[PDB]
Design a protein around this ligand. Sequence first.
Ligand SMILES: CC[C@H]1OC(=O)[C@@](C)(F)C(=O)[C@H](C)[C@@H](O[C@@H]2O[C@H](C)C[C@H](N(C)C)[C@H]2O)[C@](C)(OC)C[C@@H](C)C(=O)[C@H](C)[C@H]2N(CCCCn3cc(-c4cccc(N)c4)nn3)C(=O)O[C@]12C
Ligand SMILES: [K+]
Ligand SMILES: [K+]
Ligand SMILES: [Mg+2]
Ligand SMILES: [Mg+2]
Ligand SMILES: [Mg+2]
Ligand SMILES: [Mg+2]
Ligand SMILES: [Mg+2]
Ligand SMILES: [Mg+2]
Ligand SMILES: [Mg+2]
Ligand SMILES: [Mg+2]
Ligand SMILES: [Mg+2]
Ligand SMILES: [Mg+2]
Ligand SMILES: [Mg+2]
Ligand SMILES: [Mg+2]
Ligand SMILES: [Mg+2]
Ligand SMILES: [Mg+2]
Ligand SMILES: [Mg+2]
Ligand SMILES: [Mg+2]
Ligand SMILES: [Mg+2]
Ligand SMILES: [Mg+2]
Ligand SMILES: [Mg+2]
Ligand SMILES: [Mg+2]
Ligand SMILES: [Mg+2]
Ligand SMILES: [Mg+2]
Ligand SMILES: [Mg+2]
Ligand SMILES: [Mg+2]
Ligand SMILES: [Mg+2]
Ligand SMILES: [Mg+2]
Ligand SMILES: [Mg+2]
Ligand SMILES: [Mg+2]
Ligand SMILES: [Mg+2]
Ligand SMILES: [Zn+2]
Lengths: 42, 215, 122, 118, 111
Amino acid sequence: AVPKRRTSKTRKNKRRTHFKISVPGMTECPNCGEYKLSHRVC
Amino acid sequence: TKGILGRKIGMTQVFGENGELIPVTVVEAKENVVLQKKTVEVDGYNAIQVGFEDKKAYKKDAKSNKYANKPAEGHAKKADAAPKRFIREFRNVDVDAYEVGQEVSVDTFVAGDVIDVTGVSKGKGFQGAIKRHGQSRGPMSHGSHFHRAPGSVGMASDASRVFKGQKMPGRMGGNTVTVQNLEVVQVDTENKVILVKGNVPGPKKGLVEIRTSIK
Amino acid sequence: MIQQETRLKVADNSGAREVLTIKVLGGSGRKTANIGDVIVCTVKNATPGGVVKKGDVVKAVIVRTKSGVRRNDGSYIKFDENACVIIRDDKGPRGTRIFGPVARELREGNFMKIVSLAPEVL
Amino acid sequence: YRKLGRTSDQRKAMLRDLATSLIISERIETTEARAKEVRSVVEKLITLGKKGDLASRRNAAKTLRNVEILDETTQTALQKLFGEIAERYTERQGGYTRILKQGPRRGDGAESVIIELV
Amino acid sequence: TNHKLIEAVTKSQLRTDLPSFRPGDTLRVHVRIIRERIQVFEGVVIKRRGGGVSETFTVRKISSGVGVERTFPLHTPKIEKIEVKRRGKVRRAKLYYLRSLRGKAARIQEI
RNA sequence: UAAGGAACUCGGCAAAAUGACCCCGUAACUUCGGGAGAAGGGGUGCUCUUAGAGCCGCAGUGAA
RNA sequence: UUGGCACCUCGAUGUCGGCUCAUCGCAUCCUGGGGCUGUAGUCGGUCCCAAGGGUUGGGCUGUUCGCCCAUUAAAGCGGUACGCGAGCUGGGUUCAGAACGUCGUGAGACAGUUCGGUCCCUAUCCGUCGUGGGCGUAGGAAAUUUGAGAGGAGCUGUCCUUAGUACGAGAGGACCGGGAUGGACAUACCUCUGGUGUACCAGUUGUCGUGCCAACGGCAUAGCUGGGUAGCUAUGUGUGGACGGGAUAAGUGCUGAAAGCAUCUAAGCAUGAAGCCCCCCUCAAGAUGAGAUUUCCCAACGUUAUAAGAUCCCUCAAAGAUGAUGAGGUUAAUAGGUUCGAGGUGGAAGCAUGGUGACAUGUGGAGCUGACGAAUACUAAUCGAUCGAAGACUUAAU
Ligand SMILES: CC[C@H]1OC(=O)[C@@](C)(F)C(=O)[C@H](C)[C@@H](O[C@@H]2O[C@H](C)C[C@H](N(C)C)[C@H]2O)[C@](C)(OC)C[C@@H](C)C(=O)[C@H](C)[C@H]2N(CCCCn3cc(-c4cccc(N)c4)nn3)C(=O)O[C@]12C
Ligand SMILES: [K+]
Ligand SMILES: [K+]
Ligand SMILES: [Mg+2]
Ligand SMILES: [Mg+2]
Ligand SMILES: [Mg+2]
Ligand SMILES: [Mg+2]
Ligand SMILES: [Mg+2]
Ligand SMILES: [Mg+2]
Ligand SMILES: [Mg+2]
Ligand SMILES: [Mg+2]
Ligand SMILES: [Mg+2]
Ligand SMILES: [Mg+2]
Ligand SMILES: [Mg+2]
Ligand SMILES: [Mg+2]
Ligand SMILES: [Mg+2]
Ligand SMILES: [Mg+2]
Ligand SMILES: [Mg+2]
Ligand SMILES: [Mg+2]
Ligand SMILES: [Mg+2]
Ligand SMILES: [Mg+2]
Ligand SMILES: [Mg+2]
Ligand SMILES: [Mg+2]
Ligand SMILES: [Mg+2]
Ligand SMILES: [Mg+2]
Ligand SMILES: [Mg+2]
Ligand SMILES: [Mg+2]
Ligand SMILES: [Mg+2]
Ligand SMILES: [Mg+2]
Ligand SMILES: [Mg+2]
Ligand SMILES: [Mg+2]
Ligand SMILES: [Mg+2]
Ligand SMILES: [Zn+2]
C-alpha cells in the first residue's frame, strides 16, 4: 500500500528510461515547402 | 511414417457406415513440397523440411510477408519450388523415401490412419484465474467480497514468498497443442482435402501439422 | 440430468408417487445421472395401499428426462418430465406396471422387464 | 462495428445525426472512428436513394433526420438524398464517401478528419 | 454459401428424396431401428435449423400423456421415409410455445 | 441462462416470485371488533350487433 | 496435545471456524510389490517396500471435533504464525444496549445463558503470473532447427471371457491372462445439443412526434414479448493417462567360500514395484558454454551514402491492455462500399380482392438482414522518411 523506502534518484531515473515521446511521422509537402504528418492533408 | 501440412478450414459432419454421426475437421493440404533433407552427417539428425502454401515471388520494395524475400527465394529455388508460406520439419518420417522438390500429396494418408494433429490453439488475451486456470469463484452473496480473485497465493512467514508455478492471471491460449490418436475419415485428392475425425487446435485458416501417431 | 435433491415422478404402480434423489451411484464424485442410471432416492409422496411407502429409501432407474439423450446417429430424444422406476437389486421393477413412454436405452441397460411392461419404447 | 463510447441508443442517434449532417453539408469534420462508422451508414443511405422506390424511401426515412434545407428553394434531407445525390451517383458502384485525416485536436488530441461525398 | 471446400466434401452426404416441409407440419418419420424394423414417429415439426449436412429438425408428439420430442439430422440415412400428413398454419419458425400447452390449446390449424 | 431447485449459507443474505381493477370464495382461534387482501380461484385485447357474434397474437392491467 | 519457562514482539506480531489457493512429511487410507499366517477357496490378520497419482455429497452444531444419512478403490495422519483476513466471510470469541439464573447490602459480577451489535489501505522493494525494449552471442540478415535444462502428465471402478475351471462335503468361488465399458481429472474445439448474442428479424402496450390517413421515429430495463448469425461458450463434441525399455526397493534366488558341511554374498550371476531414469506433451542457446543447417547481401572518404534485411506511417484480424504477433499497403482484395450468397426471421410496402368492421387472402417462402462465404479497385491503404555490415588477434592444418 505505501512505499517502504524512498526511491533513490538512480532508481527513479532508471524507471524513467522509457518515459519519453517520439518525433512524429512527418513528410515534406511538395508545393508549400513545409512538413506535415504522413497520410494527413494540410 | 507420414506427415503433411495444411490449413484448418472448418468443422462439419459425415455419416459413417451404419449411419453414425462423425464430427470432422476439414484440412486443405495442397501445395506441400519437400524443400530440404536434413541428415545426421550434415545436420546431426534426420528430418525432411516441408514447405506449404506457395507465396508470391520476390519483388523490389515488397512491404509484407506475401512476397518472398531473397533468402527465402534462394532456399526455395534450391529445391526448384515456389517460395512457401509455412515451413516445418518432420523427423518421424524416413528421409530415404523423399527427394528434394517432390510433392507431398494428400494421398499420402489413407482413411483409417491414426494421426496426431499439432497446431497453435486459439488466442484469448489476458484472462483471470477462473477462466485461465479453471478455479472456483468465491460466494456471490452472503456478504462476500471475493468473486473471481485467485485466492491465497502462499503461506505465512514460512515461506515469506510465492512459489514458482503459482497460477495467476495472464495471457491465455496461443500455445502449441498436439491432439493425439485422431483418425483420418476421408481423403479427397481433388480439392486436396483430408477429413480428420473430431476437432483440432486453432482458428479457421490456422496452420496444422498432421503426423502418423506416435503411439 | 438428475442430481442430489432432484425430485422425480415415479412411472410405476409400486405406491411411490414422487421421490427425491439422495445419491447418484457409479463412482466417487459423480454429480449427475441420466436415463438408465440408478439412483438412491427417498419417497416424498405416496399413494394409499402401495407396497412402497413414504419415507422409504429405495433404488430407482431413470426412465425419462427433460434433458433427454443423444444417440450415436446424431439423433436426440427428450421428454416433458423426469420419471423413474423403483427397482430391486435384480433390476426388476418393484411395481407391476409402467406408465408413459420410456427410452430405448433401458434395453442396453438390461432393464428388460421394464422395457417389456412399458406402453411405448422410443 | 464500433461502440464510440456511447450506449446503443446514443450511438444510433449520433450516427443518424452525423449521416444527415453529411447529406446536408456534403463535407464535415469529425473524429476518425466516427467517420469510419458514418461512411457505412451514409453509403447505405445513398444505396437506398439510388434504388429510389417508395419502400426504399421509407427505409431511408427510418434513419435520416428531419432537417430542412434552404435559390430560395426548400427541400428535406430525404428529398435531397433521393434527388440530387442519387442522380449524381447513378453510375458509381459504391465508394460514395472519402475520409481525409488532418491531425490531432488541441483540446483532447483527437484525430480530426474530414469525411466528404465524392 | 458456406466454405466451398466444406460444401464440396459434404455434397455426397445430402439426400434428394426428402419432401419439402415447414414448421407446423405433421410428419410421419419412418426410422430404421435395429432384426431391422421401421418405427414410425408421427408428430408436428416444431423446429428446423442449420444448413447443409448439419441441418436438423425436431418433431413433437404426445405419447401416453407425456410430451416426447425427437431431433433428427435432415440427411441421416437412418430415416427411411418422411411423409407430410398435414400442413399446419403457424406464424413463426420455432414453435417452442407448444411445449407448455396441452389438449386443444396445443391444436394447430390446417391450411 | 440448459438440467436441477436452498444441494448455498450461521441464516434463503441477495435475487426471483406476489402485485392493479372486477367477480367468486375464505380456516383454527377470538377480547365477537377481528383473524382477512386469510387461503384459494376465475375475467380483462380489438371489432360489430344490442348480453350475443366475430377477429388477432406466444402472450390482452401485452409498457411502467 | 494439555502444560512448564518468560527469550523476540505491548510507539500493536488481528484471535476460532469456514471460503479461495495450495505446498511439504510419511508413522500409507486406496491403488502397485512382498514375507509370515492359527493362509483350503472367496475373504481376512500382521509385518516389510512404496509418497506416483488419488483420497465425497449431505442432516445437526459458529463450531474444530463428533454422531448420523447415502456413497466410494479409498473417504489416511500430520507440518506450513493450530498455512492462507494489505485474498474473502464474520456465525463464535476481549466492546458500549437489554434480559434470565446465580452471587453481591450495593455499584456491579459470572466453571453461565440469551437477543442485537462499523472488517480501513490507490502495491515502493523482494516474490509470483504475463508481456515488451536494450545490448550480447567477432560481418550483417531471413527462415528452419539440436536440446543442456525445466515444467506437465502419472488415479481408478464395473462387466464379459479364461471358468462355475483351481480349491472346497457343501455353501461358495479364484490367481495368472485376454477383452469391453465407465467415474473423476486434464486438454482442444463449436459440426451437433443448448446458453448468450444492447447496430439481426418479427409481434405488442402507453405516450410524444414526423401536418392528416397509411407508413415510420423517440422514450418507457434493449419498454415488453417470440426467435436468432458470427464470436465467446458447457451442461455439448473429440482426445489423453492401465504401453514398453533400463536400473532398483522390500523380496526371491543361482553359483559359492570364509566355516570340509550349510549358507542369496564375501567375490561373481539373475530376477523383482502404481515408485527412479526414459518413453508421452510443452517451454527452452541470456545453455554469456550464447550451439547447428539452408539461403541472401558485399564501399568509399569516425563521416556520407548504403546492401540483404527491417521499421516509421497507413488498411487491418485468425492476434491483442499497450507493446508484441499475424494478414495487407496500388506490381494491391487489407478494410469499407457495391453485387451475389449461406444463415436468421417468417410472409415488407404499395396495390387489388373479400368483410359492416376488427381483419383475411393474393401479388410473393415476400421483405429485411452485425459479425459468415465469394466476386468487384467504387473509397481509403499517397509521396515519403529512418535504421541497417564492410567482417580483430594467436596458434596448428593434411
Ligand atoms: C473505515 C475507516 C476507519 O477504519 C476502520 O475503522 C478500520 C476498519 F480500519 C479499523 O477498525 C482499523 C483496522 C483499526 O485498527 C485496529 O485497531 C485494533 C485495536 C488493533 C488492530 N491491529 C493492530 C491488531 C488494528 O488494525 C482502527 C483502530 O480503526 C478503528 C485504526 C485506527 C488508525 C483508526 O481509528 C482509523 C483512523 C479509522 N477511523 C476511526 C473509525 C471509528 C469508527 N468509525 C467511524 C466511522 C465514520 C466516520 C465518519 C463518517 C462515516 N460514514 C463513518 N466509521 N467507523 C477512521 O476514521 O478511519 C479509519 C481508517
Ligand atoms: K455451438
Ligand atoms: K544464439
Ligand atoms: Mg463453489
Ligand atoms: Mg459483489
Ligand atoms: Mg469502439
Ligand atoms: Mg431506450
Ligand atoms: Mg432455417
Ligand atoms: Mg437456470
Ligand atoms: Mg429452464
Ligand atoms: Mg420447483
Ligand atoms: Mg443445507
Ligand atoms: Mg454446506
Ligand atoms: Mg431478502
Ligand atoms: Mg399492475
Ligand atoms: Mg507450547
Ligand atoms: Mg529469568
Ligand atoms: Mg504485544
Ligand atoms: Mg513499530
Ligand atoms: Mg515407510
Ligand atoms: Mg432443512
Ligand atoms: Mg492459522
Ligand atoms: Mg495475510
Ligand atoms: Mg451492559
Ligand atoms: Mg439479592
Ligand atoms: Mg438478527
Ligand atoms: Mg532434457
Ligand atoms: Mg456455427
Ligand atoms: Mg448455437
Ligand atoms: Mg396512423
Ligand atoms: Mg422526447
Ligand atoms: Mg421524458
Ligand atoms: Zn502542404
